[PDB]
PDB file of all heavy atoms in Angstrom:
ATOM      1  N   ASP A  39      56.896 -37.712  64.367  1.00 35.77           N
ATOM      2  CA  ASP A  39      57.176 -38.908  63.423  1.00 35.77           C
ATOM      3  C   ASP A  39      57.855 -40.018  64.160  1.00 35.77           C
ATOM      4  O   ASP A  39      57.480 -41.225  64.043  1.00 35.77           O
ATOM      5  CB  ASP A  39      57.855 -38.510  62.217  1.00 35.77           C
ATOM      6  CG  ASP A  39      57.562 -39.467  61.129  1.00 35.77           C
ATOM      7  OD1 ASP A  39      56.402 -39.891  60.918  1.00 35.77           O
ATOM      8  OD2 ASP A  39      58.561 -39.795  60.279  1.00 35.77           O
ATOM      9  N   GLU A  40      58.872 -39.620  65.018  1.00 35.74           N
ATOM     10  CA  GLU A  40      59.682 -40.581  65.758  1.00 35.74           C
ATOM     11  C   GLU A  40      58.825 -41.535  66.570  1.00 35.74           C
ATOM     12  O   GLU A  40      58.885 -42.703  66.645  1.00 35.74           O
ATOM     13  CB  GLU A  40      60.777 -39.836  66.500  1.00 35.74           C
ATOM     14  CG  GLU A  40      61.770 -40.819  67.261  1.00 35.74           C
ATOM     15  CD  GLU A  40      62.550 -41.597  66.344  1.00 35.74           C
ATOM     16  OE1 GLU A  40      62.953 -41.265  65.193  1.00 35.74           O
ATOM     17  OE2 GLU A  40      62.983 -42.770  66.791  1.00 35.74           O
ATOM     18  N   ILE A  41      57.970 -40.813  67.353  1.00 36.04           N
ATOM     19  CA  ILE A  41      57.010 -41.425  68.390  1.00 36.04           C
ATOM     20  C   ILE A  41      56.072 -42.383  67.553  1.00 36.04           C
ATOM     21  O   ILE A  41      55.927 -43.496  67.990  1.00 36.04           O
ATOM     22  CB  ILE A  41      56.453 -40.369  69.228  1.00 36.04           C
ATOM     23  CG1 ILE A  41      57.339 -39.666  69.897  1.00 36.04           C
ATOM     24  CG2 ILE A  41      55.337 -41.055  70.114  1.00 36.04           C
ATOM     25  CD1 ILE A  41      56.778 -38.560  71.046  1.00 36.04           C
ATOM     26  N   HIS A  42      55.495 -41.838  66.518  1.00 36.45           N
ATOM     27  CA  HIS A  42      54.536 -42.589  65.751  1.00 36.45           C
ATOM     28  C   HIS A  42      55.108 -43.858  65.134  1.00 36.45           C
ATOM     29  O   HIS A  42      54.388 -44.849  65.104  1.00 36.45           O
ATOM     30  CB  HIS A  42      53.607 -41.712  64.917  1.00 36.45           C
ATOM     31  CG  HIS A  42      52.490 -42.471  64.353  1.00 36.45           C
ATOM     32  ND1 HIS A  42      51.233 -42.439  64.902  1.00 36.45           N
ATOM     33  CD2 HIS A  42      52.302 -43.273  63.230  1.00 36.45           C
ATOM     34  CE1 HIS A  42      50.357 -43.256  64.270  1.00 36.45           C
ATOM     35  NE2 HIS A  42      51.033 -43.717  63.264  1.00 36.45           N
ATOM     36  N   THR A  43      56.282 -43.622  64.436  1.00 34.81           N
ATOM     37  CA  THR A  43      56.867 -44.739  63.749  1.00 34.81           C
ATOM     38  C   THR A  43      57.058 -45.974  64.613  1.00 34.81           C
ATOM     39  O   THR A  43      57.031 -47.138  64.254  1.00 34.81           O
ATOM     40  CB  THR A  43      58.051 -44.457  62.902  1.00 34.81           C
ATOM     41  OG1 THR A  43      57.794 -43.410  61.891  1.00 34.81           O
ATOM     42  CG2 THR A  43      58.555 -45.600  62.108  1.00 34.81           C
ATOM     43  N   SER A  44      57.549 -45.677  65.943  1.00 32.16           N
ATOM     44  CA  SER A  44      57.899 -46.614  66.870  1.00 32.16           C
ATOM     45  C   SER A  44      56.885 -46.738  67.988  1.00 32.16           C
ATOM     46  O   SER A  44      57.234 -47.194  69.074  1.00 32.16           O
ATOM     47  CB  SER A  44      59.325 -46.372  67.424  1.00 32.16           C
ATOM     48  OG  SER A  44      60.304 -46.465  66.373  1.00 32.16           O
ATOM     49  N   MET A  45      55.724 -46.290  67.702  1.00 31.72           N
ATOM     50  CA  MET A  45      54.630 -46.284  68.663  1.00 31.72           C
ATOM     51  C   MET A  45      54.523 -47.688  69.293  1.00 31.72           C
ATOM     52  O   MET A  45      54.301 -47.764  70.541  1.00 31.72           O
ATOM     53  CB  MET A  45      53.272 -45.871  68.083  1.00 31.72           C
ATOM     54  CG  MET A  45      52.085 -46.289  68.837  1.00 31.72           C
ATOM     55  SD  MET A  45      51.808 -45.080  70.187  1.00 31.72           S
ATOM     56  CE  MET A  45      51.826 -43.540  69.244  1.00 31.72           C
ATOM     57  N   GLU A  46      54.671 -48.779  68.618  1.00 33.17           N
ATOM     58  CA  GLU A  46      54.351 -50.115  69.058  1.00 33.17           C
ATOM     59  C   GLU A  46      55.597 -50.706  69.868  1.00 33.17           C
ATOM     60  O   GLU A  46      55.362 -51.833  70.408  1.00 33.17           O
ATOM     61  CB  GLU A  46      54.002 -51.025  67.967  1.00 33.17           C
ATOM     62  CG  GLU A  46      52.571 -50.702  67.340  1.00 33.17           C
ATOM     63  CD  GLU A  46      51.370 -50.996  68.388  1.00 33.17           C
ATOM     64  OE1 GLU A  46      51.173 -50.309  69.350  1.00 33.17           O
ATOM     65  OE2 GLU A  46      50.720 -52.073  68.112  1.00 33.17           O
ATOM     66  N   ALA A  47      56.672 -50.046  69.855  1.00 37.27           N
ATOM     67  CA  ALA A  47      57.938 -50.696  70.522  1.00 37.27           C
ATOM     68  C   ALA A  47      57.880 -50.606  72.007  1.00 37.27           C
ATOM     69  O   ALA A  47      58.706 -51.259  72.659  1.00 37.27           O
ATOM     70  CB  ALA A  47      59.182 -50.129  69.805  1.00 37.27           C
ATOM     71  N   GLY A  48      57.176 -49.714  72.671  1.00 36.87           N
ATOM     72  CA  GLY A  48      57.249 -49.448  73.992  1.00 36.87           C
ATOM     73  C   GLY A  48      57.062 -48.007  74.283  1.00 36.87           C
ATOM     74  O   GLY A  48      57.097 -47.256  73.397  1.00 36.87           O
ATOM     75  N   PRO A  49      57.019 -47.566  75.636  1.00 34.45           N
ATOM     76  CA  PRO A  49      56.806 -46.215  76.001  1.00 34.45           C
ATOM     77  C   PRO A  49      57.969 -45.329  75.670  1.00 34.45           C
ATOM     78  O   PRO A  49      59.112 -45.725  76.012  1.00 34.45           O
ATOM     79  CB  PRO A  49      56.537 -46.299  77.445  1.00 34.45           C
ATOM     80  CG  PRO A  49      57.115 -47.570  77.856  1.00 34.45           C
ATOM     81  CD  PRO A  49      57.006 -48.567  76.660  1.00 34.45           C
ATOM     82  N   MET A  50      57.824 -44.107  75.157  1.00 37.65           N
ATOM     83  CA  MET A  50      58.781 -43.236  74.906  1.00 37.65           C
ATOM     84  C   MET A  50      59.140 -42.333  76.227  1.00 37.65           C
ATOM     85  O   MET A  50      58.309 -42.249  77.026  1.00 37.65           O
ATOM     86  CB  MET A  50      58.452 -42.213  73.858  1.00 37.65           C
ATOM     87  CG  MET A  50      58.085 -42.856  72.570  1.00 37.65           C
ATOM     88  SD  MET A  50      59.311 -44.001  72.022  1.00 37.65           S
ATOM     89  CE  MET A  50      58.962 -44.165  70.239  1.00 37.65           C
ATOM     90  N   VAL A  51      60.458 -41.905  76.206  1.00 36.24           N
ATOM     91  CA  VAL A  51      60.776 -40.912  77.244  1.00 36.24           C
ATOM     92  C   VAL A  51      59.985 -39.660  77.166  1.00 36.24           C
ATOM     93  O   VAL A  51      59.384 -39.394  76.149  1.00 36.24           O
ATOM     94  CB  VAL A  51      62.401 -40.502  77.142  1.00 36.24           C
ATOM     95  CG1 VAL A  51      63.209 -41.754  77.295  1.00 36.24           C
ATOM     96  CG2 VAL A  51      62.586 -39.895  75.760  1.00 36.24           C
ATOM     97  N   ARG A  52      60.019 -38.842  78.313  1.00 33.74           N
ATOM     98  CA  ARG A  52      59.240 -37.635  78.231  1.00 33.74           C
ATOM     99  C   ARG A  52      59.658 -36.643  77.202  1.00 33.74           C
ATOM    100  O   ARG A  52      60.750 -36.707  76.621  1.00 33.74           O
ATOM    101  CB  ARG A  52      59.335 -37.004  79.689  1.00 33.74           C
ATOM    102  CG  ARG A  52      59.031 -37.830  80.848  1.00 33.74           C
ATOM    103  CD  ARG A  52      59.152 -37.155  82.273  1.00 33.74           C
ATOM    104  NE  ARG A  52      58.485 -35.877  82.086  1.00 33.74           N
ATOM    105  CZ  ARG A  52      58.189 -35.086  83.175  1.00 33.74           C
ATOM    106  NH1 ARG A  52      58.453 -35.533  84.384  1.00 33.74           N
ATOM    107  NH2 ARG A  52      57.613 -33.893  82.994  1.00 33.74           N
ATOM    108  N   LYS A  53      58.756 -35.681  76.860  1.00 30.66           N
ATOM    109  CA  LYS A  53      58.976 -34.643  75.813  1.00 30.66           C
ATOM    110  C   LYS A  53      60.201 -33.760  76.060  1.00 30.66           C
ATOM    111  O   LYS A  53      61.041 -33.641  75.081  1.00 30.66           O
ATOM    112  CB  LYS A  53      57.701 -33.750  75.747  1.00 30.66           C
ATOM    113  CG  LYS A  53      57.790 -32.759  74.674  1.00 30.66           C
ATOM    114  CD  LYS A  53      56.909 -31.580  74.977  1.00 30.66           C
ATOM    115  CE  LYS A  53      55.454 -31.840  75.218  1.00 30.66           C
ATOM    116  NZ  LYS A  53      54.618 -30.633  75.196  1.00 30.66           N
ATOM    117  N   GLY A  54      60.457 -33.261  77.242  1.00 29.55           N
ATOM    118  CA  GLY A  54      61.542 -32.481  77.605  1.00 29.55           C
ATOM    119  C   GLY A  54      62.916 -33.194  77.348  1.00 29.55           C
ATOM    120  O   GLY A  54      63.869 -32.621  76.970  1.00 29.55           O
ATOM    121  N   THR A  55      62.751 -34.541  77.455  1.00 31.33           N
ATOM    122  CA  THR A  55      64.024 -35.365  77.363  1.00 31.33           C
ATOM    123  C   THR A  55      64.322 -35.827  76.038  1.00 31.33           C
ATOM    124  O   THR A  55      65.542 -36.221  75.693  1.00 31.33           O
ATOM    125  CB  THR A  55      63.644 -36.682  78.199  1.00 31.33           C
ATOM    126  OG1 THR A  55      63.242 -36.282  79.601  1.00 31.33           O
ATOM    127  CG2 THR A  55      64.788 -37.657  78.268  1.00 31.33           C
ATOM    128  N   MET A  56      63.422 -35.634  75.085  1.00 31.59           N
ATOM    129  CA  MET A  56      63.621 -35.981  73.682  1.00 31.59           C
ATOM    130  C   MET A  56      64.761 -35.149  73.088  1.00 31.59           C
ATOM    131  O   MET A  56      65.548 -35.555  72.182  1.00 31.59           O
ATOM    132  CB  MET A  56      62.446 -35.873  72.747  1.00 31.59           C
ATOM    133  CG  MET A  56      61.363 -36.956  73.070  1.00 31.59           C
ATOM    134  SD  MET A  56      61.945 -38.435  72.216  1.00 31.59           S
ATOM    135  CE  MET A  56      60.666 -39.513  72.807  1.00 31.59           C
ATOM    136  N   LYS A  57      64.789 -33.946  73.542  1.00 37.32           N
ATOM    137  CA  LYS A  57      65.808 -32.873  73.111  1.00 37.32           C
ATOM    138  C   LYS A  57      67.299 -33.338  73.142  1.00 37.32           C
ATOM    139  O   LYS A  57      68.081 -32.819  72.415  1.00 37.32           O
ATOM    140  CB  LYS A  57      65.577 -31.628  73.846  1.00 37.32           C
ATOM    141  CG  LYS A  57      64.130 -31.263  73.976  1.00 37.32           C
ATOM    142  CD  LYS A  57      63.813 -29.900  74.686  1.00 37.32           C
ATOM    143  CE  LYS A  57      62.330 -29.653  75.028  1.00 37.32           C
ATOM    144  NZ  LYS A  57      61.999 -28.488  75.686  1.00 37.32           N
ATOM    145  N   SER A  58      67.527 -34.347  74.022  1.00 35.21           N
ATOM    146  CA  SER A  58      68.882 -34.730  74.234  1.00 35.21           C
ATOM    147  C   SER A  58      69.197 -36.260  73.782  1.00 35.21           C
ATOM    148  O   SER A  58      70.262 -36.742  74.016  1.00 35.21           O
ATOM    149  CB  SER A  58      69.293 -34.655  75.794  1.00 35.21           C
ATOM    150  OG  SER A  58      68.225 -34.025  76.503  1.00 35.21           O
ATOM    151  N   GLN A  59      68.150 -36.856  73.210  1.00 37.74           N
ATOM    152  CA  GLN A  59      68.338 -38.209  72.738  1.00 37.74           C
ATOM    153  C   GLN A  59      69.378 -38.354  71.579  1.00 37.74           C
ATOM    154  O   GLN A  59      69.446 -37.558  70.742  1.00 37.74           O
ATOM    155  CB  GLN A  59      66.962 -38.847  72.284  1.00 37.74           C
ATOM    156  CG  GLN A  59      65.922 -39.037  73.504  1.00 37.74           C
ATOM    157  CD  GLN A  59      66.321 -40.318  74.349  1.00 37.74           C
ATOM    158  OE1 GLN A  59      66.294 -41.450  73.709  1.00 37.74           O
ATOM    159  NE2 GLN A  59      66.434 -40.130  75.597  1.00 37.74           N
ATOM    160  N   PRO A  60      70.036 -39.612  71.569  1.00 39.10           N
ATOM    161  CA  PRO A  60      70.971 -39.984  70.529  1.00 39.10           C
ATOM    162  C   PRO A  60      70.324 -39.779  69.205  1.00 39.10           C
ATOM    163  O   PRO A  60      71.054 -39.397  68.288  1.00 39.10           O
ATOM    164  CB  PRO A  60      71.155 -41.418  70.794  1.00 39.10           C
ATOM    165  CG  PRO A  60      71.089 -41.576  72.351  1.00 39.10           C
ATOM    166  CD  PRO A  60      69.987 -40.515  72.726  1.00 39.10           C
ATOM    167  N   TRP A  61      69.066 -40.185  68.903  1.00 38.24           N
ATOM    168  CA  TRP A  61      68.490 -40.208  67.585  1.00 38.24           C
ATOM    169  C   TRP A  61      68.473 -38.657  67.113  1.00 38.24           C
ATOM    170  O   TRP A  61      68.935 -38.447  65.949  1.00 38.24           O
ATOM    171  CB  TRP A  61      67.109 -40.764  67.491  1.00 38.24           C
ATOM    172  CG  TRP A  61      65.996 -39.893  68.066  1.00 38.24           C
ATOM    173  CD1 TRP A  61      65.464 -39.978  69.383  1.00 38.24           C
ATOM    174  CD2 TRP A  61      65.307 -38.846  67.401  1.00 38.24           C
ATOM    175  NE1 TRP A  61      64.551 -39.032  69.553  1.00 38.24           N
ATOM    176  CE2 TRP A  61      64.271 -38.340  68.344  1.00 38.24           C
ATOM    177  CE3 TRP A  61      65.399 -38.302  66.144  1.00 38.24           C
ATOM    178  CZ2 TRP A  61      63.473 -37.363  67.968  1.00 38.24           C
ATOM    179  CZ3 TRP A  61      64.442 -37.310  65.885  1.00 38.24           C
ATOM    180  CH2 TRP A  61      63.595 -36.718  66.764  1.00 38.24           C
ATOM    181  N   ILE A  62      68.071 -37.740  67.907  1.00 38.53           N
ATOM    182  CA  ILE A  62      67.931 -36.331  67.432  1.00 38.53           C
ATOM    183  C   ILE A  62      69.274 -35.619  67.269  1.00 38.53           C
ATOM    184  O   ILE A  62      69.453 -34.814  66.395  1.00 38.53           O
ATOM    185  CB  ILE A  62      66.973 -35.585  68.529  1.00 38.53           C
ATOM    186  CG1 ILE A  62      66.152 -34.535  67.598  1.00 38.53           C
ATOM    187  CG2 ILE A  62      67.782 -34.834  69.532  1.00 38.53           C
ATOM    188  CD1 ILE A  62      65.076 -33.832  68.500  1.00 38.53           C
ATOM    189  N   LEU A  63      70.274 -35.978  68.136  1.00 42.32           N
ATOM    190  CA  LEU A  63      71.570 -35.306  68.004  1.00 42.32           C
ATOM    191  C   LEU A  63      72.156 -35.768  66.660  1.00 42.32           C
ATOM    192  O   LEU A  63      72.857 -34.941  65.969  1.00 42.32           O
ATOM    193  CB  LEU A  63      72.473 -35.700  69.237  1.00 42.32           C
ATOM    194  CG  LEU A  63      72.041 -35.307  70.579  1.00 42.32           C
ATOM    195  CD1 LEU A  63      73.068 -35.405  71.669  1.00 42.32           C
ATOM    196  CD2 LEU A  63      71.446 -33.843  70.519  1.00 42.32           C
ATOM    197  N   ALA A  64      72.039 -37.063  66.376  1.00 40.04           N
ATOM    198  CA  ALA A  64      72.633 -37.567  65.080  1.00 40.04           C
ATOM    199  C   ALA A  64      71.831 -37.027  63.878  1.00 40.04           C
ATOM    200  O   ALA A  64      72.418 -36.657  62.889  1.00 40.04           O
ATOM    201  CB  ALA A  64      72.446 -39.074  65.074  1.00 40.04           C
ATOM    202  N   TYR A  65      70.545 -36.817  64.076  1.00 42.27           N
ATOM    203  CA  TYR A  65      69.686 -36.208  62.982  1.00 42.27           C
ATOM    204  C   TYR A  65      70.103 -34.831  62.529  1.00 42.27           C
ATOM    205  O   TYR A  65      70.268 -34.507  61.435  1.00 42.27           O
ATOM    206  CB  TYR A  65      68.211 -36.303  63.484  1.00 42.27           C
ATOM    207  CG  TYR A  65      67.253 -35.303  62.935  1.00 42.27           C
ATOM    208  CD1 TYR A  65      66.685 -35.354  61.625  1.00 42.27           C
ATOM    209  CD2 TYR A  65      66.864 -34.296  63.814  1.00 42.27           C
ATOM    210  CE1 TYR A  65      65.813 -34.402  61.258  1.00 42.27           C
ATOM    211  CE2 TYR A  65      65.948 -33.318  63.395  1.00 42.27           C
ATOM    212  CZ  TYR A  65      65.364 -33.327  62.130  1.00 42.27           C
ATOM    213  OH  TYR A  65      64.441 -32.422  61.794  1.00 42.27           O
ATOM    214  N   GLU A  66      70.373 -33.975  63.562  1.00 43.31           N
ATOM    215  CA  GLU A  66      70.822 -32.574  63.389  1.00 43.31           C
ATOM    216  C   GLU A  66      72.149 -32.594  62.635  1.00 43.31           C
ATOM    217  O   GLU A  66      72.356 -31.865  61.599  1.00 43.31           O
ATOM    218  CB  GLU A  66      70.935 -31.780  64.637  1.00 43.31           C
ATOM    219  CG  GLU A  66      69.672 -31.411  65.243  1.00 43.31           C
ATOM    220  CD  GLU A  66      68.910 -30.343  64.462  1.00 43.31           C
ATOM    221  OE1 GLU A  66      69.533 -29.836  63.378  1.00 43.31           O
ATOM    222  OE2 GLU A  66      67.797 -29.938  64.816  1.00 43.31           O
ATOM    223  N   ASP A  67      73.015 -33.426  62.984  1.00 45.17           N
ATOM    224  CA  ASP A  67      74.440 -33.502  62.465  1.00 45.17           C
ATOM    225  C   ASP A  67      74.392 -34.028  61.116  1.00 45.17           C
ATOM    226  O   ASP A  67      75.135 -33.659  60.176  1.00 45.17           O
ATOM    227  CB  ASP A  67      75.344 -34.241  63.342  1.00 45.17           C
ATOM    228  CG  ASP A  67      75.622 -33.549  64.739  1.00 45.17           C
ATOM    229  OD1 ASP A  67      75.173 -32.435  64.904  1.00 45.17           O
ATOM    230  OD2 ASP A  67      76.293 -34.163  65.634  1.00 45.17           O
ATOM    231  N   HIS A  68      73.526 -35.143  60.919  1.00 43.96           N
ATOM    232  CA  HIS A  68      73.399 -35.769  59.646  1.00 43.96           C
ATOM    233  C   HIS A  68      72.898 -34.816  58.642  1.00 43.96           C
ATOM    234  O   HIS A  68      73.212 -34.928  57.477  1.00 43.96           O
ATOM    235  CB  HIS A  68      72.375 -36.967  59.737  1.00 43.96           C
ATOM    236  CG  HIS A  68      72.411 -37.841  58.555  1.00 43.96           C
ATOM    237  ND1 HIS A  68      73.507 -38.174  57.856  1.00 43.96           N
ATOM    238  CD2 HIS A  68      71.316 -38.238  57.935  1.00 43.96           C
ATOM    239  CE1 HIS A  68      73.143 -38.871  56.884  1.00 43.96           C
ATOM    240  NE2 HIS A  68      71.758 -38.958  56.812  1.00 43.96           N
ATOM    241  N   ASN A  69      71.987 -33.915  59.015  1.00 44.86           N
ATOM    242  CA  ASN A  69      71.341 -32.877  58.085  1.00 44.86           C
ATOM    243  C   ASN A  69      72.433 -32.083  57.420  1.00 44.86           C
ATOM    244  O   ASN A  69      72.617 -32.004  56.178  1.00 44.86           O
ATOM    245  CB  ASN A  69      70.277 -32.102  58.746  1.00 44.86           C
ATOM    246  CG  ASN A  69      69.359 -31.347  57.822  1.00 44.86           C
ATOM    247  OD1 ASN A  69      69.669 -30.244  57.459  1.00 44.86           O
ATOM    248  ND2 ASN A  69      68.335 -32.050  57.403  1.00 44.86           N
ATOM    249  N   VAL A  70      73.206 -31.394  58.313  1.00 47.42           N
ATOM    250  CA  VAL A  70      74.289 -30.599  57.883  1.00 47.42           C
ATOM    251  C   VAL A  70      75.289 -31.336  57.075  1.00 47.42           C
ATOM    252  O   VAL A  70      75.635 -30.934  55.944  1.00 47.42           O
ATOM    253  CB  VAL A  70      74.965 -30.036  59.157  1.00 47.42           C
ATOM    254  CG1 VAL A  70      76.266 -29.273  58.745  1.00 47.42           C
ATOM    255  CG2 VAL A  70      74.068 -29.202  59.915  1.00 47.42           C
ATOM    256  N   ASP A  71      75.854 -32.589  57.527  1.00 47.10           N
ATOM    257  CA  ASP A  71      76.692 -33.275  56.700  1.00 47.10           C
ATOM    258  C   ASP A  71      76.218 -33.572  55.267  1.00 47.10           C
ATOM    259  O   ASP A  71      76.978 -33.445  54.335  1.00 47.10           O
ATOM    260  CB  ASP A  71      77.010 -34.701  57.383  1.00 47.10           C
ATOM    261  CG  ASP A  71      77.712 -34.547  58.718  1.00 47.10           C
ATOM    262  OD1 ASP A  71      78.274 -33.397  59.025  1.00 47.10           O
ATOM    263  OD2 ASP A  71      77.803 -35.584  59.464  1.00 47.10           O
ATOM    264  N   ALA A  72      74.963 -34.024  55.213  1.00 42.40           N
ATOM    265  CA  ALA A  72      74.383 -34.315  53.836  1.00 42.40           C
ATOM    266  C   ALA A  72      74.272 -33.132  52.901  1.00 42.40           C
ATOM    267  O   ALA A  72      74.738 -33.163  51.757  1.00 42.40           O
ATOM    268  CB  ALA A  72      73.012 -34.923  54.040  1.00 42.40           C
ATOM    269  N   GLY A  73      73.778 -31.981  53.472  1.00 41.78           N
ATOM    270  CA  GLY A  73      73.772 -30.757  52.779  1.00 41.78           C
ATOM    271  C   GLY A  73      75.088 -30.359  52.236  1.00 41.78           C
ATOM    272  O   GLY A  73      75.339 -30.232  51.070  1.00 41.78           O
ATOM    273  N   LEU A  74      76.143 -30.325  53.228  1.00 46.07           N
ATOM    274  CA  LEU A  74      77.527 -30.017  52.844  1.00 46.07           C
ATOM    275  C   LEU A  74      78.135 -30.991  51.778  1.00 46.07           C
ATOM    276  O   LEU A  74      78.768 -30.540  50.831  1.00 46.07           O
ATOM    277  CB  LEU A  74      78.393 -29.911  54.072  1.00 46.07           C
ATOM    278  CG  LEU A  74      78.011 -28.882  55.100  1.00 46.07           C
ATOM    279  CD1 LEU A  74      79.197 -28.538  55.954  1.00 46.07           C
ATOM    280  CD2 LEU A  74      77.577 -27.496  54.451  1.00 46.07           C
ATOM    281  N   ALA A  75      77.870 -32.203  51.965  1.00 44.46           N
ATOM    282  CA  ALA A  75      78.496 -33.253  51.032  1.00 44.46           C
ATOM    283  C   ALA A  75      77.815 -33.107  49.622  1.00 44.46           C
ATOM    284  O   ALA A  75      78.397 -33.531  48.685  1.00 44.46           O
ATOM    285  CB  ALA A  75      78.166 -34.620  51.554  1.00 44.46           C
ATOM    286  N   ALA A  76      76.581 -32.728  49.628  1.00 44.59           N
ATOM    287  CA  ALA A  76      75.868 -32.432  48.376  1.00 44.59           C
ATOM    288  C   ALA A  76      76.280 -31.044  47.791  1.00 44.59           C
ATOM    289  O   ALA A  76      75.749 -30.651  46.749  1.00 44.59           O
ATOM    290  CB  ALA A  76      74.326 -32.525  48.526  1.00 44.59           C
ATOM    291  N   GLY A  77      77.182 -30.402  48.420  1.00 47.40           N
ATOM    292  CA  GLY A  77      77.698 -29.155  47.893  1.00 47.40           C
ATOM    293  C   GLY A  77      76.937 -27.954  48.160  1.00 47.40           C
ATOM    294  O   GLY A  77      76.973 -26.965  47.370  1.00 47.40           O
ATOM    295  N   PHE A  78      76.327 -27.793  49.463  1.00 48.04           N
ATOM    296  CA  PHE A  78      75.366 -26.714  49.623  1.00 48.04           C
ATOM    297  C   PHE A  78      76.157 -25.393  49.854  1.00 48.04           C
ATOM    298  O   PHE A  78      75.645 -24.323  49.559  1.00 48.04           O
ATOM    299  CB  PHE A  78      74.528 -27.056  50.785  1.00 48.04           C
ATOM    300  CG  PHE A  78      73.169 -27.695  50.464  1.00 48.04           C
ATOM    301  CD1 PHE A  78      73.123 -28.581  49.455  1.00 48.04           C
ATOM    302  CD2 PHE A  78      72.032 -27.395  51.054  1.00 48.04           C
ATOM    303  CE1 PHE A  78      71.933 -29.302  49.167  1.00 48.04           C
ATOM    304  CE2 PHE A  78      70.776 -28.026  50.818  1.00 48.04           C
ATOM    305  CZ  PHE A  78      70.763 -28.944  49.820  1.00 48.04           C
ATOM    306  N   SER A  79      77.357 -25.459  50.471  1.00 49.30           N
ATOM    307  CA  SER A  79      78.117 -24.215  50.880  1.00 49.30           C
ATOM    308  C   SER A  79      77.858 -22.925  50.062  1.00 49.30           C
ATOM    309  O   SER A  79      77.394 -21.914  50.603  1.00 49.30           O
ATOM    310  CB  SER A  79      79.577 -24.438  51.099  1.00 49.30           C
ATOM    311  OG  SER A  79      79.754 -25.481  52.143  1.00 49.30           O
ATOM    312  N   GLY A  80      78.319 -23.039  48.853  1.00 49.59           N
ATOM    313  CA  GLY A  80      78.041 -21.823  47.981  1.00 49.59           C
ATOM    314  C   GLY A  80      76.781 -21.813  47.145  1.00 49.59           C
ATOM    315  O   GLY A  80      76.816 -21.176  46.052  1.00 49.59           O
ATOM    316  N   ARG A  81      75.770 -22.612  47.561  1.00 48.00           N
ATOM    317  CA  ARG A  81      74.649 -22.881  46.658  1.00 48.00           C
ATOM    318  C   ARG A  81      73.322 -22.857  47.210  1.00 48.00           C
ATOM    319  O   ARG A  81      72.309 -22.339  46.737  1.00 48.00           O
ATOM    320  CB  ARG A  81      74.907 -24.193  45.972  1.00 48.00           C
ATOM    321  CG  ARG A  81      76.047 -24.277  45.084  1.00 48.00           C
ATOM    322  CD  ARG A  81      76.349 -25.726  44.631  1.00 48.00           C
ATOM    323  NE  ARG A  81      77.509 -25.886  43.715  1.00 48.00           N
ATOM    324  CZ  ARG A  81      78.760 -26.095  44.138  1.00 48.00           C
ATOM    325  NH1 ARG A  81      78.964 -26.192  45.419  1.00 48.00           N
ATOM    326  NH2 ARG A  81      79.727 -26.292  43.333  1.00 48.00           N
ATOM    327  N   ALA A  82      73.153 -23.356  48.506  1.00 48.07           N
ATOM    328  CA  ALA A  82      71.818 -23.544  49.159  1.00 48.07           C
ATOM    329  C   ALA A  82      71.869 -23.319  50.580  1.00 48.07           C
ATOM    330  O   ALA A  82      72.967 -23.264  51.233  1.00 48.07           O
ATOM    331  CB  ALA A  82      71.162 -24.856  48.747  1.00 48.07           C
ATOM    332  N   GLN A  83      70.726 -23.266  51.303  1.00 49.58           N
ATOM    333  CA  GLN A  83      70.669 -23.040  52.715  1.00 49.58           C
ATOM    334  C   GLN A  83      70.759 -24.402  53.462  1.00 49.58           C
ATOM    335  O   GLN A  83      69.994 -25.348  53.089  1.00 49.58           O
ATOM    336  CB  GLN A  83      69.522 -22.236  53.116  1.00 49.58           C
ATOM    337  CG  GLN A  83      69.489 -20.787  52.744  1.00 49.58           C
ATOM    338  CD  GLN A  83      68.246 -20.026  53.182  1.00 49.58           C
ATOM    339  OE1 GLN A  83      67.080 -20.539  53.056  1.00 49.58           O
ATOM    340  NE2 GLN A  83      68.459 -18.856  53.615  1.00 49.58           N
ATOM    341  N   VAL A  84      71.521 -24.395  54.479  1.00 45.89           N
ATOM    342  CA  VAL A  84      71.360 -25.450  55.545  1.00 45.89           C
ATOM    343  C   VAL A  84      70.655 -24.841  56.752  1.00 45.89           C
ATOM    344  O   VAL A  84      71.285 -23.929  57.420  1.00 45.89           O
ATOM    345  CB  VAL A  84      72.769 -26.000  55.913  1.00 45.89           C
ATOM    346  CG1 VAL A  84      72.610 -26.996  57.099  1.00 45.89           C
ATOM    347  CG2 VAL A  84      73.360 -26.668  54.688  1.00 45.89           C
ATOM    348  N   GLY A  85      69.480 -25.208  57.034  1.00 46.50           N
ATOM    349  CA  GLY A  85      68.689 -24.509  58.019  1.00 46.50           C
ATOM    350  C   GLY A  85      68.443 -25.227  59.244  1.00 46.50           C
ATOM    351  O   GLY A  85      68.357 -26.481  59.328  1.00 46.50           O
TER     352      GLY A  85
END
């Protein structure tokens, strides 16, 4: 999705390199934060 949404902005870094990009590191952490803030701990899975 990341590549497609910004397809027109210029060439993306290689596939292996995406794993370490600022966008993805923030996305992982953001997921957990949101789940936890919405009260997931004793209620739902954060996966």
